[PDB]
C-alpha cells in the first residue's frame, strides 16, 4: 500500500487485448478517452503502478475521492487520462489468523499530494510533548496491518489494483498499439497502408534488391513504386490500378446512333475488339 | 503428478517428540498461494486441522495445541518436517500432509496415511 | 464447526442430498467450502471444492450448492462403488474445520 511499485514500460507494443482472457477484470472504469478504442491509440510514457487493497476501496482509486487511502497513501490527480484495472485476489492474498503482508498507513499529518510515494515510516507527534515512539500512547505508529482473511464477504477481501499512467503529452511517441496484418493479395489492384504509406496499386513481386535499412522507394517523378512487405522481407512493387482517357467515336447523330468506344492506355485486357497502339 | 509420501517412526516412546516429515514431490512450494499442512484423523472419527505454513515462512498452527505443533519448511531438500511435542495416547490417529494450492482449493491432493500408535 | 448427518441412504438410481450446516457459523460469509471422499482404507480425496465450480477429474455426478448458509451436495446415479465418507471443509477465524461425518448407505 505504501510502497506501489512502479515499472514504467516504454518502446514496446501494448496490447491491451490479452488482458480481456485473463481473469475476470469487473473493474474496467477507464477514466480516460476510450476503453474500446484503446489499441489504435499510442502513448508516449505509460507508467504501470500496482497496490492491493479491500474491497470497499477500489472507488477511492478514482480522480477525486475522499476516504483513507485516497488521501494519505495514494492519491491520483483530476487529470489521470487512463484506466484502473483491479480483481479479486482472495484465492492467493488471503491466509487463515490473517494475512498480515500487506501494511497501509493510517495517521498522516498532511493530505497526500498527487504522486507521492512514503516510503519513510516515522512515529506520527503530539502535543505539548516529544514522543519519541516507543510505547507512547498519545502517539502512534503510522503504518497498519490489513487482516485479510477468507472469512470475510465481498468488500474486505483483497483486491490487487493496478493503473496505467498514460501522460498524453505531445512528444515522439514510442509506445504504440499493434495493428492488424491481412494477408496479402498479389496481381490485383486494391489499398495498402504499408507503415503508414497510403495508396491504391497492383502489388506484384519485383526484382529489385533494396539495402537492409531501405523500407521505401521511389522513382524519377517523385512516387512510390517499390515497398518491402513488413512481415516477409520481399521486395515488393507498386503499380497504380489501371486507368485511361474514354473517347467516344460517333459518326453523328442525324446519320446514327451506334457509337465506337476507345479506352486509351489499355491492352484489351483491364475492361468486336481490336487492339490498336 | 503431486506425490505427497510420509515417513518417520511410526512407533516411538510415550511423552517425547514425534519427527514425522512429508517428502513432496512435483511441485514447488514458492508458489503464491501454495502450502503443505497436517490433518488428524482419529480411528472412528473426523478430520482436524493441526498445522499449516506457506510460501513465506508463516507457520498457522491450531487455536487449541500451540505449545507443541511446529512445522518447519526445508524446501531446499523438499521436506516438510512437523514436530509435536507432550505425546498422550489420546493422539493415536492416521495423520496426513496435503497441499493447499489456493485458497479455494482446500488441502485438492492429499497423503497416504502414516499410523501412530503409542499408548504403552 | 460443522454437523453433518449420520446416517444417509440411497437407492441405485436415485439422488441424495448432504447437509453442511452453520452450528455457531463463526465461518462468516461462508464463501469457500470443499467436500471430500474418504474410502474405508484409503486416504481422503477432494471432490469438489468451490461449490459453483468442480475439480478435474470428477464426473458431472457430482455437484454442490449454498442457498443461503448450509452446503449441499447433490450426489445423482448412486452406484455400489460410492459408500464412502464425506466432509464439508471451510476457514474458520483462526482455523480450518473439517466437520463431521457423512456415512453413506447404498441398499438394493
Known amino acids: 500500500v505504501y510502497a506501489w511499485n512502479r515499472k514504467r514500460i516504454s518502446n514496446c507494443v501494448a496490447d491491451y487485448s490479452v488482458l480481456y482472457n485473463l481473469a475476470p477484470f469487473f473493474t474496467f472504469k477507464c477514466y480516460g478517452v476510450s476503453p474500446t478504442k484503446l489499441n489504435d491509440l499510442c502513448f508516449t510514457n505509460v507508467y504501470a503502478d500496482s497496490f492491493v487493497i479491500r474491497g470497499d476501496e477500489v472507488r477511492q482509486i478514482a480522480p477525486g475521492q475522499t476516504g483513507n487511502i485516497a488521501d494519505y497513501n495514494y492519491k491520483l490527480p483530476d487529470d489521470f487520462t487512463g484506466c484502473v484495472i483491479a480483481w479479486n485476489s482472495n484465492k492467493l492474498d488471503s491466509k487463515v489468523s490473517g494475512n498480515y503482508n500487506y501494511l497501509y498507513r493510517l495517521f498522516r499529518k498532511s493530505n497526500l499530494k498527487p504522486f507521492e510515494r512514503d516510503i519513510s515510516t516515522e512515529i506520527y507527534q503530539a502535543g505539548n510533548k516529544p514522543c519519541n515512539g516507543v510505547a507512547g500512547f498519545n502517539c502512534y505508529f503510522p503504518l497498519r496491518s490489513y487482516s485479510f482473511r477468507p472469512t470475510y464477504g465481498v468488500g474486505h477481501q483483497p483486491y490487487r489494483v493496478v493503473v496505467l499512467s498514460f501522460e498524453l503529452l505531445h512528444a515522439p511517441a514510442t509506445v504504440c498499439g499493434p495493428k492488424k496484418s491481412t494477408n496479402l493479395v498479389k496481381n490485383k489492384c486494391v489499398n495498402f497502408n504499408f507503415n503508414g504509406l497510403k495508396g491504391t496499386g497492383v502489388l506484384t513481386e519485383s526484382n529489385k534488391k533494396f539495402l537492409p535499412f531501405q523500407q521505401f522507394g521511389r522513382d524519377i517523378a517523385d512516387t512510390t513504386d517499390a515497398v518491402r512487405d513488413p512481415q516477409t522481407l520481399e521486395i515488393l512493387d507498386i503499380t497504380p490500378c489501371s486507368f485511361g482517357g474514354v473517347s467516344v467515336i460517333t459518326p453523328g447523330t442525324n446519320t446514327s446512333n451506334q457509337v465506337a468506344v476507345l479506352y486509351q492506355g489499355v491492352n484489351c485486357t483491364e475492361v468486336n475488339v481490336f487492339q490498336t497502339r | 503428478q503431486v506425490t505427497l509420501r510420509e515417513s518417520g517412526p511410526t512407533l516411538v516412546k510415550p511423552k517425547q517428540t514425534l519427527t514425522l516429515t512429508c517428502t513432496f514431490s512435483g511441485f514447488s512450494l514458492s508458489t503464491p498461494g501454495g502450502g503443505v499442512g497436517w490433518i488428524r484423523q482419529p480411528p472412528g472419527k473426523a478430520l482436524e486441522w493441526l498445522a499449516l505454513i506457506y510460501w513465506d515462512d508463516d507457520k498457522r498452527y491450531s487455536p487449541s495445541l500451540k505449545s507443541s505443533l511446529t512445522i518447519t519448511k526445508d524446501t531446499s531438500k523438499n521436506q516438510v518436517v512437523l514436530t509435536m511435542t507432550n505425546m498422550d495416547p489420546v493422539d493415536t490417529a492416521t495423520y496426513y500432509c496435503?497441499?493447499?494450492?489456493?485458497?479455494?482449493?482446500?488441502?485438492?491432493?492429499w497423503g497416504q496415511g502414516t499410523l501412530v500408535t503409542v499408548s504403552s | 464447526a460443522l454437523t453433518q448427518p449420520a446416517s444417509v441412504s440411497g437407492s441405485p438410481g436415485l439422488s441424495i442430498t448432504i447437509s453442511c450446516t452453520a452450528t455457531?457459523?463463526?465461518?462468516?460469509?461462508?464463501?469457500?467450502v470443499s467436500w471430500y471422499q474418504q474410502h474405508p482404507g484409503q486416504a481422503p480425496k477432494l471432490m469438489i471444492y468451490?461449490?459453483?465450480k468442480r475439480p478435474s477429474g470428477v464426473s458431472n455426478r457430482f455437484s454442490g450448492s449454498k442457498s443461503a448458509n448450509t452446503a449441499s451436495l447433490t450426489i445423482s446415479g448412486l452406484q455400489a462403488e460410492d459408500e464412502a465418507d464425506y466432509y464439508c471443509?471451510?476457514?474458520?477465524?483462526?482455523?480450518?474445520?473439517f466437520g463431521g461425518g457423512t456415512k453413506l448407505t447404498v441398499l438394493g
Open positions: 468451490d461449490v459453483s
Open positions: 471443509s471451510s476457514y474458520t477465524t483462526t482455523s480450518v474445520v
Open positions: 496435503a497441499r493447499l494450492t489456493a485458497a479455494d482449493t482446500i488441502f485438492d491432493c
Open positions: 455457531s457459523s463463526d465461518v462468516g460469509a461462508y464463501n469457500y
